[PDB]
Tab-separated table of C-alpha atoms in Angstrom:
chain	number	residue	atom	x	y	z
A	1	UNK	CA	0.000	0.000	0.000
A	2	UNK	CA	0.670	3.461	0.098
A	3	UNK	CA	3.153	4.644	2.733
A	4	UNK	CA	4.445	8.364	3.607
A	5	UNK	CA	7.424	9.654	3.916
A	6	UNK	CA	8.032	9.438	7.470
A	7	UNK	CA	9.506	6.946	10.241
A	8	UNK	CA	6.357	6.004	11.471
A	9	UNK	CA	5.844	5.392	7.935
A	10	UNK	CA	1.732	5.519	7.700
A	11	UNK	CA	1.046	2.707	5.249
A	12	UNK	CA	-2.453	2.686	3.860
A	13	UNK	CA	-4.528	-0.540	2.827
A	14	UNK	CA	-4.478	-0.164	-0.627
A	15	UNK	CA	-2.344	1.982	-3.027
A	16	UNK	CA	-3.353	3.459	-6.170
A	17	UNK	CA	0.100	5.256	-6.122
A	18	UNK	CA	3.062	2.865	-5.888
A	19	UNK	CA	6.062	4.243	-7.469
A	20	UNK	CA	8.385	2.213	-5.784
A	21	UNK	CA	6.915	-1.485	-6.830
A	22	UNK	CA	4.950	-0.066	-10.206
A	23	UNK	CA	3.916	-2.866	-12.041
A	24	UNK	CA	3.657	-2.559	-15.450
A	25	UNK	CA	3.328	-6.125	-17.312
A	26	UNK	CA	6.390	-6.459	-19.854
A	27	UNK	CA	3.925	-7.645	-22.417
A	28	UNK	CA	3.249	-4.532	-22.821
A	29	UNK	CA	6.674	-3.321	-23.359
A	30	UNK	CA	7.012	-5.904	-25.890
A	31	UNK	CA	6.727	-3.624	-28.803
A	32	UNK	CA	9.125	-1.194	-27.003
A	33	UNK	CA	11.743	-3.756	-26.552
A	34	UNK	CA	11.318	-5.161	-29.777
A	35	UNK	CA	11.199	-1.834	-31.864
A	36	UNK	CA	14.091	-0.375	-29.779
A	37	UNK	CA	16.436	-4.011	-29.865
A	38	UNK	CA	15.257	-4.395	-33.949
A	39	UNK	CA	17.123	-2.502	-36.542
A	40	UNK	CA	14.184	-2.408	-38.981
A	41	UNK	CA	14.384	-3.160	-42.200
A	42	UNK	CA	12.367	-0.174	-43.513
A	43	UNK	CA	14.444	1.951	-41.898
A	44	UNK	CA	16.716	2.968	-44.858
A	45	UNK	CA	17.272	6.459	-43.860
A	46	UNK	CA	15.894	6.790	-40.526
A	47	UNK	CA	16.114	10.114	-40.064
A	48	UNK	CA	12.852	11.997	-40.107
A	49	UNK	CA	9.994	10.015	-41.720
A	50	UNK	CA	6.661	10.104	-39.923
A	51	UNK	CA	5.807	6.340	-40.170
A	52	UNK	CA	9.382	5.109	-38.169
A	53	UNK	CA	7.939	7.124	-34.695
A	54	UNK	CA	4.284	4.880	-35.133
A	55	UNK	CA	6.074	2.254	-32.614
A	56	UNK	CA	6.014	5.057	-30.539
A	57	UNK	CA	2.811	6.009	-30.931
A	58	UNK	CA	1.930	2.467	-29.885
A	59	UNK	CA	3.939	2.443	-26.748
A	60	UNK	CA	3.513	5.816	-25.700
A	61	UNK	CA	-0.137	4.560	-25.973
A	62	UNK	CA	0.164	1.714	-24.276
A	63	UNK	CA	2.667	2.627	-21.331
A	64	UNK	CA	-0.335	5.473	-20.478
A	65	UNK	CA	-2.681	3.544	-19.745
A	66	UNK	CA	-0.610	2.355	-16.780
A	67	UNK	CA	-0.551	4.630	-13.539
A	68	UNK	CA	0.884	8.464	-14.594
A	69	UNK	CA	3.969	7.554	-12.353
A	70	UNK	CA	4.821	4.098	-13.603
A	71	UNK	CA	4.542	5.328	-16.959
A	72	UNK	CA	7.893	6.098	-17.080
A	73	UNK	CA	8.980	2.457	-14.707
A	74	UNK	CA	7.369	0.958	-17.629
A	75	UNK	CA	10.136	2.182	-19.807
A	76	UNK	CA	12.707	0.969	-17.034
A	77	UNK	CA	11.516	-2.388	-17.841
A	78	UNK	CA	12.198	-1.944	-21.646
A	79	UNK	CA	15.560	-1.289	-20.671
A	80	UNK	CA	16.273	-4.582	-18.416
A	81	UNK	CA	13.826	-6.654	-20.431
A	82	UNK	CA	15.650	-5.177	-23.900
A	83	UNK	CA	19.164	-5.740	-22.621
A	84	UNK	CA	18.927	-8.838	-21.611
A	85	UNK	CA	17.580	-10.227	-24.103
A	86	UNK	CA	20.047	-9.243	-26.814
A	87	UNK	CA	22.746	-10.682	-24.416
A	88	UNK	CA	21.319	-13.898	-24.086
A	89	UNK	CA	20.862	-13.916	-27.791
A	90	UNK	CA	24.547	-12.697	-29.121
A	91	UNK	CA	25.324	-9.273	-28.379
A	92	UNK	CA	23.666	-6.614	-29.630
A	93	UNK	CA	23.748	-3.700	-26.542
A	94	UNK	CA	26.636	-1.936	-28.555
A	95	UNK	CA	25.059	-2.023	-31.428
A	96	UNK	CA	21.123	-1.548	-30.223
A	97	UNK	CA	22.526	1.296	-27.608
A	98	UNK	CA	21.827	4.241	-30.396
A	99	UNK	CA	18.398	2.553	-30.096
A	100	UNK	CA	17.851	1.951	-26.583
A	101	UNK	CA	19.006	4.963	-25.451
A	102	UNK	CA	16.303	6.505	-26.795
A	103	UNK	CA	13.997	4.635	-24.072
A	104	UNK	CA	15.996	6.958	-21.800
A	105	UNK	CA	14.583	9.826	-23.396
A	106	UNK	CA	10.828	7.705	-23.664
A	107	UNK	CA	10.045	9.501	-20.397
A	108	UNK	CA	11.011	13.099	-21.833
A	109	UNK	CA	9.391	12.380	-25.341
A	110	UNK	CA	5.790	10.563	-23.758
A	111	UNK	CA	5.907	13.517	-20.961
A	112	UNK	CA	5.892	11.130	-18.284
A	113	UNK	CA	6.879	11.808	-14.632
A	114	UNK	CA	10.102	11.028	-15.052
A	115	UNK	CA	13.382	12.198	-17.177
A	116	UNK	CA	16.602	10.305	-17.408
Protein backbone atom coordinates (compact mmCIF):
# COMPACT_ATOMS: atom_id res chain seq x y z
CA UNK A 1 0.00 0.00 0.00
CA UNK A 2 0.67 3.46 0.10
CA UNK A 3 3.15 4.64 2.73
CA UNK A 4 4.45 8.36 3.61
CA UNK A 5 7.42 9.65 3.92
CA UNK A 6 8.03 9.44 7.47
CA UNK A 7 9.51 6.95 10.24
CA UNK A 8 6.36 6.00 11.47
CA UNK A 9 5.84 5.39 7.94
CA UNK A 10 1.73 5.52 7.70
CA UNK A 11 1.05 2.71 5.25
CA UNK A 12 -2.45 2.69 3.86
CA UNK A 13 -4.53 -0.54 2.83
CA UNK A 14 -4.48 -0.16 -0.63
CA UNK A 15 -2.34 1.98 -3.03
CA UNK A 16 -3.35 3.46 -6.17
CA UNK A 17 0.10 5.26 -6.12
CA UNK A 18 3.06 2.87 -5.89
CA UNK A 19 6.06 4.24 -7.47
CA UNK A 20 8.38 2.21 -5.78
CA UNK A 21 6.92 -1.49 -6.83
CA UNK A 22 4.95 -0.07 -10.21
CA UNK A 23 3.92 -2.87 -12.04
CA UNK A 24 3.66 -2.56 -15.45
CA UNK A 25 3.33 -6.13 -17.31
CA UNK A 26 6.39 -6.46 -19.85
CA UNK A 27 3.92 -7.64 -22.42
CA UNK A 28 3.25 -4.53 -22.82
CA UNK A 29 6.67 -3.32 -23.36
CA UNK A 30 7.01 -5.90 -25.89
CA UNK A 31 6.73 -3.62 -28.80
CA UNK A 32 9.12 -1.19 -27.00
CA UNK A 33 11.74 -3.76 -26.55
CA UNK A 34 11.32 -5.16 -29.78
CA UNK A 35 11.20 -1.83 -31.86
CA UNK A 36 14.09 -0.38 -29.78
CA UNK A 37 16.44 -4.01 -29.87
CA UNK A 38 15.26 -4.39 -33.95
CA UNK A 39 17.12 -2.50 -36.54
CA UNK A 40 14.18 -2.41 -38.98
CA UNK A 41 14.38 -3.16 -42.20
CA UNK A 42 12.37 -0.17 -43.51
CA UNK A 43 14.44 1.95 -41.90
CA UNK A 44 16.72 2.97 -44.86
CA UNK A 45 17.27 6.46 -43.86
CA UNK A 46 15.89 6.79 -40.53
CA UNK A 47 16.11 10.11 -40.06
CA UNK A 48 12.85 12.00 -40.11
CA UNK A 49 9.99 10.01 -41.72
CA UNK A 50 6.66 10.10 -39.92
CA UNK A 51 5.81 6.34 -40.17
CA UNK A 52 9.38 5.11 -38.17
CA UNK A 53 7.94 7.12 -34.69
CA UNK A 54 4.28 4.88 -35.13
CA UNK A 55 6.07 2.25 -32.61
CA UNK A 56 6.01 5.06 -30.54
CA UNK A 57 2.81 6.01 -30.93
CA UNK A 58 1.93 2.47 -29.88
CA UNK A 59 3.94 2.44 -26.75
CA UNK A 60 3.51 5.82 -25.70
CA UNK A 61 -0.14 4.56 -25.97
CA UNK A 62 0.16 1.71 -24.28
CA UNK A 63 2.67 2.63 -21.33
CA UNK A 64 -0.34 5.47 -20.48
CA UNK A 65 -2.68 3.54 -19.74
CA UNK A 66 -0.61 2.36 -16.78
CA UNK A 67 -0.55 4.63 -13.54
CA UNK A 68 0.88 8.46 -14.59
CA UNK A 69 3.97 7.55 -12.35
CA UNK A 70 4.82 4.10 -13.60
CA UNK A 71 4.54 5.33 -16.96
CA UNK A 72 7.89 6.10 -17.08
CA UNK A 73 8.98 2.46 -14.71
CA UNK A 74 7.37 0.96 -17.63
CA UNK A 75 10.14 2.18 -19.81
CA UNK A 76 12.71 0.97 -17.03
CA UNK A 77 11.52 -2.39 -17.84
CA UNK A 78 12.20 -1.94 -21.65
CA UNK A 79 15.56 -1.29 -20.67
CA UNK A 80 16.27 -4.58 -18.42
CA UNK A 81 13.83 -6.65 -20.43
CA UNK A 82 15.65 -5.18 -23.90
CA UNK A 83 19.16 -5.74 -22.62
CA UNK A 84 18.93 -8.84 -21.61
CA UNK A 85 17.58 -10.23 -24.10
CA UNK A 86 20.05 -9.24 -26.81
CA UNK A 87 22.75 -10.68 -24.42
CA UNK A 88 21.32 -13.90 -24.09
CA UNK A 89 20.86 -13.92 -27.79
CA UNK A 90 24.55 -12.70 -29.12
CA UNK A 91 25.32 -9.27 -28.38
CA UNK A 92 23.67 -6.61 -29.63
CA UNK A 93 23.75 -3.70 -26.54
CA UNK A 94 26.64 -1.94 -28.55
CA UNK A 95 25.06 -2.02 -31.43
CA UNK A 96 21.12 -1.55 -30.22
CA UNK A 97 22.53 1.30 -27.61
CA UNK A 98 21.83 4.24 -30.40
CA UNK A 99 18.40 2.55 -30.10
CA UNK A 100 17.85 1.95 -26.58
CA UNK A 101 19.01 4.96 -25.45
CA UNK A 102 16.30 6.51 -26.79
CA UNK A 103 14.00 4.63 -24.07
CA UNK A 104 16.00 6.96 -21.80
CA UNK A 105 14.58 9.83 -23.40
CA UNK A 106 10.83 7.71 -23.66
CA UNK A 107 10.05 9.50 -20.40
CA UNK A 108 11.01 13.10 -21.83
CA UNK A 109 9.39 12.38 -25.34
CA UNK A 110 5.79 10.56 -23.76
CA UNK A 111 5.91 13.52 -20.96
CA UNK A 112 5.89 11.13 -18.28
CA UNK A 113 6.88 11.81 -14.63
CA UNK A 114 10.10 11.03 -15.05
CA UNK A 115 13.38 12.20 -17.18
CA UNK A 116 16.60 10.30 -17.41
Amino acid sequence: GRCTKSIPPICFPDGLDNPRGCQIRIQQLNHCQMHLTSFDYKLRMAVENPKQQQHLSLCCNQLQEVEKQCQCEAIKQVVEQAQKQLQQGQGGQQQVQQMVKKAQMLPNQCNLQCSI
